[PDB]
């Protein structure tokens, strides 16, 4: 039985309507609506993808196609209602996503309610030298966050109320730094912070075990945001 995956390709956007689409995920990339590269990759690694967003006629057809409830975590809750076990979440704008990258996550992810793959600066500039990312210096290195999230639906189920809370402060740095704590903020803002420290506080906050997965495959996070990208 193929495990579930969820693609949050939902999201209306600006330039996307230039291509007369609306959602960035439906913008063509190398011949097909961008998100299909993601779907192809998911099935490829043996998963059944649930698709949240507009479906003009996506190929490969996703296992289920839920509509858009107007938000990254709102869509996630919707899709969760339709899955079981450990699920891999992904946004529909990382067209470079490969099966190898997906299986790594699956195979190397530690046993935790929540696992978030992160990529080292070192490898991000191995294929995509141009790509400009928001990094963070940790004692263990310099990374950026993926666009994938591995969840244990059942374990996570109980952290959603906080998830909602923390997600609501995605647009309020000061507010968000309240939750994280000042000390920590500076620590990493200086590189003075470490990976387990990050993980241990994340856990403190959510109540569930949360870990990061150093993932050598940068296609896990290099998304497409504008025209230059598509080329
Ligand atoms: Na204060």
Question: Cis bond leading into 60, ω under 30°?
Answer: yes
Alpha-carbon span 140 to 138, nearest angstrom: 5
Distance 175 CA to ligand 1 centre (A): 9
Distance 75 CA to ligand 1 centre (A): 32
Distance 198 CA to ligand 1 centre (A): 22
Question: Rounded to the nearest 5 degrees, what angle is found at the Cα of 72, between the Cα atoms of 96 and 150?
Answer: 60
Instruction: State the residue range of the domain holding 194.
Output: 2-231
19: which residues sit within 8 A by CB, 6+ positions away? 26, 27, 28
Give the SS3 label for residue 82: coil
Alpha-carbon span 87 to 5, nearest angstrom: 5
CATH number for the domain spanning 189: value is: 3.90.550.10
Distance 180 CA to ligand 1 centre (A): 13
66 conformational bin, left if phi > 0, alpha if psi -120 to 50, beta if neither? beta
Question: Rounded to the nearest 5 degrees, what angle is found at the Cα of 57, between the Cα atoms of 36 and 4?
Answer: 50
| DSSP classification of residue 3 | P
Method: X-ray
Distance 203 CA to ligand 1 centre (A): 23
Alpha-carbon span 104 to 212, nearest angstrom: 13
Alpha-carbon span 109 to 54, nearest angstrom: 30
Distance 143 CA to ligand 1 centre (A): 29
Distance 170 CA to ligand 1 centre (A): 18
Give the SS3 label for residue 170: coil
Count of domains for the chain: 1
Q: How is residue 128 written in tokens? A: 């995509």
Number of H helices, E strands in the chain: 10, 11
């Amino acid at each position: 039985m193929r495990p579930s995956a969820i693609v949050l390709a939902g999201g209306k956007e600006a330039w996307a309507e230039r291509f007369g689409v609306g959602s960035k995920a439906l913008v063509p990339y190398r011949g097909r609506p961008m998100v299909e590269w993601v779907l192809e990759a998911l099935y490829a690694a043996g998963l059944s993808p649930v698709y949240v967003g507009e479906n003009p006629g996506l190929v490969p057809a996703p296992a289920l196609t839920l509509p858009d409830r107007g938000g990254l975590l709102e869509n996630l809750e919707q899709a969760l209602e339709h899955v079981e076990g450990r699920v891999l979440v992904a946004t529909g704008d990382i067209p470079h996503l490969t099966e190898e990258a997906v299986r790594f996550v699956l195979d190397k992810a530690p046993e935790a309610a929540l696992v978030y793959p992160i990529v080292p600066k070192e490898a991000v500039e191995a294929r995509f030298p141009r790509t400009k990312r928001t990094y963070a210096r940790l004692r263990e290195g310099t990374f950026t966050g993926g666009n994938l999230l591995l969840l244990d639906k059942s374990l996570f189920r109980k952290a959603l109320p906080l998830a909602r809370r923390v997600v609501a402060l995605r647009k309020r740095p000061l507010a968000l730094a309240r939750l994280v704590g000042w000390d920590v903020l500076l620590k990493l803002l200086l590189g003075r912070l470490s990976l387990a420290e990050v993980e241990a506080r994340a856990q403190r906050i959510l109540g569930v075990e949360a870990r990061a997965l150093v993932t050598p495959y940068p296609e896990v996070g290099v998304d497409v945001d504008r025209e230059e990208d598509l080329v």
